[PDB]
Write a protein that holds these residues in place. Sequence first.
Motif, short mmCIF file in Angstrom:
data_model
loop_
_atom_site.label_atom_id
_atom_site.label_comp_id
_atom_site.label_asym_id
_atom_site.label_seq_id
_atom_site.Cartn_x
_atom_site.Cartn_y
_atom_site.Cartn_z
N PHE A 45 0.85 -1.18 0.00
CA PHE A 45 0.00 0.00 0.00
C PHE A 45 0.89 1.23 0.00
CE2 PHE A 45 0.63 -1.65 4.26
CZ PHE A 45 1.08 -0.55 4.98
N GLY A 46 0.31 2.38 -0.33
CA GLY A 46 1.07 3.61 -0.36
C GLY A 46 0.48 4.69 -1.24
N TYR A 47 1.33 5.63 -1.63
CA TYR A 47 0.87 6.87 -2.26
C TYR A 47 0.52 6.75 -3.74
CZ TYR A 47 2.81 9.04 1.99
OH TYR A 47 3.11 9.39 3.28
N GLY A 64 -1.80 12.32 0.73
CA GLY A 64 -1.38 11.08 1.38
C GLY A 64 -2.49 10.23 1.99
N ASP A 65 -3.74 10.62 1.80
CA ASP A 65 -4.86 9.79 2.26
C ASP A 65 -5.22 8.77 1.18
OD1 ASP A 65 -7.11 8.60 3.27
OD2 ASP A 65 -8.28 10.44 3.50
N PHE A 66 -4.48 7.66 1.15
CA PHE A 66 -4.73 6.60 0.17
C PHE A 66 -5.80 5.60 0.63
CE2 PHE A 66 -2.47 3.54 2.65
CZ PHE A 66 -1.36 4.18 3.17
N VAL A 67 -6.37 5.83 1.81
CA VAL A 67 -7.40 4.94 2.36
C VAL A 67 -8.80 5.45 2.02
CG1 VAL A 67 -8.36 3.89 4.46
CG2 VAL A 67 -5.87 4.22 4.23
N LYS A 68 -9.05 6.72 2.32
CA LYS A 68 -10.37 7.34 2.10
C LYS A 68 -10.38 8.40 0.99
CE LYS A 68 -12.13 6.36 6.72
NZ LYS A 68 -12.75 6.91 7.96
N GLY A 69 -9.21 8.96 0.66
CA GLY A 69 -9.08 9.93 -0.43
C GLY A 69 -9.59 11.34 -0.17
N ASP A 70 -10.03 11.62 1.06
CA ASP A 70 -10.66 12.91 1.37
C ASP A 70 -10.05 13.65 2.58
OD1 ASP A 70 -11.55 11.30 3.42
OD2 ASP A 70 -13.68 11.49 2.95
N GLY A 71 -8.94 13.15 3.10
CA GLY A 71 -8.28 13.77 4.24
C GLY A 71 -8.75 13.28 5.60
N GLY A 73 -8.63 9.85 6.38
CA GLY A 73 -8.01 8.55 6.60
C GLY A 73 -6.52 8.47 6.32
N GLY A 74 -6.01 7.24 6.33
CA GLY A 74 -4.60 6.97 6.13
C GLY A 74 -4.09 5.94 7.12
N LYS A 75 -2.91 5.41 6.85
CA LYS A 75 -2.26 4.47 7.76
C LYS A 75 -0.78 4.42 7.47
CE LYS A 75 -3.09 0.34 4.92
NZ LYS A 75 -3.64 -1.04 4.91
N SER A 76 0.00 4.08 8.48
CA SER A 76 1.45 3.99 8.35
C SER A 76 1.87 2.54 8.21
CB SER A 76 2.14 4.61 9.57
OG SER A 76 2.09 3.74 10.69
N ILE A 77 3.15 2.33 7.89
CA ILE A 77 3.71 0.98 7.84
C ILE A 77 3.81 0.34 9.23
CG2 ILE A 77 5.00 1.47 5.72
CD1 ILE A 77 7.56 1.56 7.47
N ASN A 105 0.97 12.31 18.53
CA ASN A 105 1.18 10.88 18.31
C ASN A 105 0.07 10.21 17.49
OD1 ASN A 105 3.59 11.00 19.95
ND2 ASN A 105 2.24 11.08 21.74
N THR A 106 -0.34 10.86 16.41
CA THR A 106 -1.36 10.32 15.50
C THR A 106 -0.90 10.37 14.04
OG1 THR A 106 -2.51 12.46 15.34
CG2 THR A 106 -3.29 10.93 17.03
N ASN A 107 0.39 10.17 13.82
CA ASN A 107 0.93 10.14 12.46
C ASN A 107 0.46 8.90 11.72
OD1 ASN A 107 2.95 12.47 12.57
ND2 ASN A 107 3.54 11.23 14.35
N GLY A 108 0.13 9.06 10.45
CA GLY A 108 -0.29 7.94 9.61
C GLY A 108 0.42 8.01 8.28
N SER A 109 -0.31 8.40 7.24
CA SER A 109 0.26 8.58 5.91
C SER A 109 0.14 10.00 5.38
CB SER A 109 -0.41 7.63 4.92
OG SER A 109 -1.82 7.80 4.91
N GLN A 110 -0.81 10.78 5.90
CA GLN A 110 -1.02 12.12 5.39
C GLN A 110 0.16 13.02 5.71
OE1 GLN A 110 -4.80 14.17 5.63
NE2 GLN A 110 -5.82 12.26 6.20
N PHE A 111 0.50 13.87 4.75
CA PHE A 111 1.63 14.77 4.86
C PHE A 111 1.26 16.06 4.18
CE2 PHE A 111 1.83 12.63 0.84
CZ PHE A 111 2.19 13.62 -0.06
N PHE A 112 2.06 17.10 4.40
CA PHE A 112 1.94 18.31 3.60
C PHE A 112 3.30 18.82 3.15
CE2 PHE A 112 2.88 21.35 7.08
CZ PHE A 112 2.64 20.56 8.18
#
Length: 164
Positions: A45-47, A64-71, A73-77, A105-112
């Motif tokens: 999974f990823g970007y 970086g929200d590859f789970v829900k596509g709308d900001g 969701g997301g998840k990390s490795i 402490n809620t980092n996932g996949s979303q970035f800016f």
Amino acid sequence: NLPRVFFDIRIGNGDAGRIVMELRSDIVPRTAENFRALCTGERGFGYHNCCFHRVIPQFMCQGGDFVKGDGTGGKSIYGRKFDDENFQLRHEGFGVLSMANSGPNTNGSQFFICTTKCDWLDGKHVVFGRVVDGQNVVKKMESVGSKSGKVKEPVIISRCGELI
């Protein structure tokens, strides 16, 4: 050696070019590794085909929200979330890469990607890299951005990975 990763960006019906990013694994190895692995897709999974869901001209672009596509969701490795590694790097100017979150402490996949100096975000978001090439491509995104952040045409990571 510091990882070098890339996004190929498509804005609406046009290829916009490549953003190349250097990841500061020397400072935030865990956070850099998450981003690198999501670029290569090595965990399954990823970007790839992920969008930028907010573009605020002269402030930042968020994706970086590859789970829900709308900001939302997301998840990390490492799992659904992981801890703030440290706050040693600063939002010191154009191209700084930083983790979006929903509190400590809620980092996932979303970035800016910052497109200006935003010192006020220091100590709230973990900075982990910087755009080193394709600054024009980041700036190109502004054509479909707005003051509110609403995006006018799809801004898609059509391809991503790691470079030598």
